[PDB]
Amino acid sequence: SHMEQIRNALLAALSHDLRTPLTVLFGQAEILTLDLASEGSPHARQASEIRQHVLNTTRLVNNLLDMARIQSGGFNLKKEWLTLEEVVGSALQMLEPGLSSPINLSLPEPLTLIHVDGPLFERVLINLLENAVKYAGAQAEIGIDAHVEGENLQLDVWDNGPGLPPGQEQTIFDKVGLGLAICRAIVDVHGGTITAFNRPEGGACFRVTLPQQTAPELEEF
Amino acid sequence: MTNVLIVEDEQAIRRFLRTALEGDGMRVFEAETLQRGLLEAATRKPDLIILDLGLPDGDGIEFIRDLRQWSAVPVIVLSARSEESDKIAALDAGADDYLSKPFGIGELQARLRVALRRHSAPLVKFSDVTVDLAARVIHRGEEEVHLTPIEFRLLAVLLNNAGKVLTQRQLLNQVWGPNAVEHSHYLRIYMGHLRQKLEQDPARPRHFITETGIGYRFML
């Protein structure tokens, strides 16, 4: 029946309705946070803490909305042709500021065109990066490597640090933590897959491979 | 001195918006509907307008279409469906900037200045690169960089719209024209060429900012 397409949209709809209270909450929290720390108020700490838990909440919802977005088979997918450099650079700006050292980028041909739904595939980079940042340990060396093997874009989010338990590295996509699973779910909908392996050097690498029907020049100028 | 018109139906977001703007040297008007919103756009003629695309009055897209036929007030748009179709439509029909619907009192404060300094009253330089549209010569570290004519036009569009997002369509029509509505990938490559030759770290742009799903925006 379509009684699961009715449920799917119910999830997609409630997720979209959840943004308006977050807006009000996040706005009202910031104003409190300021208004209270403007004056000499001891509770300013408490307003500030409330702010943060609205951020955390809104992230969890921004993950729950992209999910239900791609719950309709993933024809919520506008896949333009994007410079690989600007895809990576866009994820870098969203987490590299609050970091110790920059991510080691390795892009040989940066102006490769990649076929992705830009924002959704930016979510993949951030999550693969953040999972490295969370579990690779402080002073870890995180990187990004992006070759082309066939007409498949190979993208690797690697770190030193512990790495996966050797037995089953492809179980790690089973929530500790989501976000890997969200990465699979998003890149599955894109046509590709995501595998994880320990590097010989040490640590974990996460490999994103995408089908790339063309490599457009298409006009020569 | 600088008045804002809040066009947003949800009484909750408006009190927030009002309370936050009034905390600056600025006073606000409101409108629960798209209809009354157009009214106090005539009756008050604000310095800048904030409108959510959530209004049920009938899509707010044509509100800015209408508004722009006479007025050139900057319009900051609020996007509930933060899937970019709406934000592009708004930006294309005359909007100046956007905020995604969970937003902070900084981004609201930022994107208001950038559109009030951009609406009051020659050849500028961004921190390492000196661009001079007059003679069409561009230095990076006391050294001329040679740029294709098309590359120079694309730079010039950006360079005059400092601090304002430009959608994939605005940029194409102002570098080629209405010819290649679909052959967009050149805009992204040439922007990469501009990046590779004028940015300290091309993959970490400081001035040629990517705005994924929307377009590009030049800074500083």
Bridge partner residues of A146 (DSSP): A155
Q: How far is B35 from chain A (nearest CA, A)?
A: 22
Residue A148 belongs to domain spanning: 81-211
Within a 13 Å sphere around the CA of B120, how many CA atoms are in the beta-carbon half? 10
Q: How far is A41 from chain B (nearest CA, A)?
A: 18
Using alpha carbons, select from A92, A76, A30, A114 the residue that is nearest to residue B82: A76
- HEC-encoded secondary structure of chain A: CCCCHHHHHHHHHHHHHCHHHHHHHHHHHHHHHHHHHHCCCCCHHHHHHHHHHHHHHHHHHHHHHHHHHCCCCCCCCCCEEEEHHHHHHHHHHHHCCCCCCCCEEECCCCCCEEEECHHHHHHHHHHHHHHHHHHCCCCCCEEEEEEECCCEEEEEEEECCCCCCCCCCCCCCCCCCCCHHHHHHHHHHCCCEEEEEECCCCCEEEEEEEECCCCCCCCCC
Contact A54, A26 (CB under 8 A): yes
The first and second tokens of residue A179, run together, are 């976000």
| Cα angle A151-A154-A156, degrees, rounded to a multiple of 5 | 175
Residues 6+ apart with CB under 8 A from B102: A19, A22, A23, A26, A58
- The DSSP code for B212 is T
Domain CATH number, residue A88: 3.30.565.10
Which run of H or of E encompasses B42?
Answer: helix B34-43
Using alpha carbons, select from B33, B24, B25, B84 the residue that is nearest to residue B6: B33
* CB neighbourhood size of A209 (10 A): 18
Whole-number Å distance between alpha carbons of A195 and A207: 5
Q: Cα dist. B135→A189, B129, B131, B141, B174 in Å?
A: 50, 15, 9, 18, 20
Among the partner residues B12, B20, B101, nearest to A19 by beta-carbon distance: B101
Using alpha carbons, select from B135, B79, B62, B104 the residue that is nearest to residue A31: B104
Bridge partner residues of B137 (DSSP): B132
B204 to A107: CB separation less than 8 angstroms, yes or no: no
Q: Please tell me if residue A92 touches chain B, with a CB cutoff of 8 Å.
A: yes
> In chain B, positions 22-41, which contact chain A (CB-CB < 8 Å)?
23
The first and second tokens of residue B35, run together, are 């209809």
Q: Cα dist. B90→A79, B9, B74, B163, B165 in Å?
A: 21, 18, 12, 17, 12
Whole-number Å distance between alpha carbons of A215 and A218: 9
Among the partner residues A34, A76, A107, nearest to B203 by beta-carbon distance: A107
Among the partner residues A26, A90, A107, nearest to B104 by beta-carbon distance: A26
B189 to A76: CB separation less than 8 angstroms, yes or no: no
Among the partner residues B10, B16, B183, nearest to A218 by beta-carbon distance: B183
Whole-number Å distance between alpha carbons of A115 and A112: 10
- HEC-encoded secondary structure of B50-107: EEECCCCCCCCHHHHHHHHCCCCCCEEEEECCCCCHHHHHHHHCCCCEEEECCCCHHH
Q: Which position has the token pair 């995501």?
A: A194
Whole-number Å distance between alpha carbons of B20 and B112: 12
Contact B9, B55 (CB under 8 A): yes
Domains of chain B listed by start with CATH number: 3-119 (3.40.50.2300), 125-218 (1.10.10.10)
CA dihedral B181, B182, B183, B188 (to 10 degrees): 90
Q: Cα dist. B13→B41, B74, B203 in Å?
A: 19, 20, 37
* CB neighbourhood size of A147 (10 A): 14
Amino acid at B150: I
CB-based burial label for B121 (10 Å; 0-12, 13-18, 19+): exposed
- Experimental resolution (Å): 3.0
Taking contacts as CB-CB distances below 8 angstroms, the residues of chain A near B204 are 89, 92-93, 96, 102
Whole-number Å distance between alpha carbons of A175 and A194: 16
Whole-number Å distance between alpha carbons of A31 and A48: 10
Taking contacts as CB-CB distances below 8 angstroms, the residues of chain A near B82 are 19
Bridge partner residues of A216 (DSSP): none
B203 to A92: CB separation less than 8 angstroms, yes or no: yes
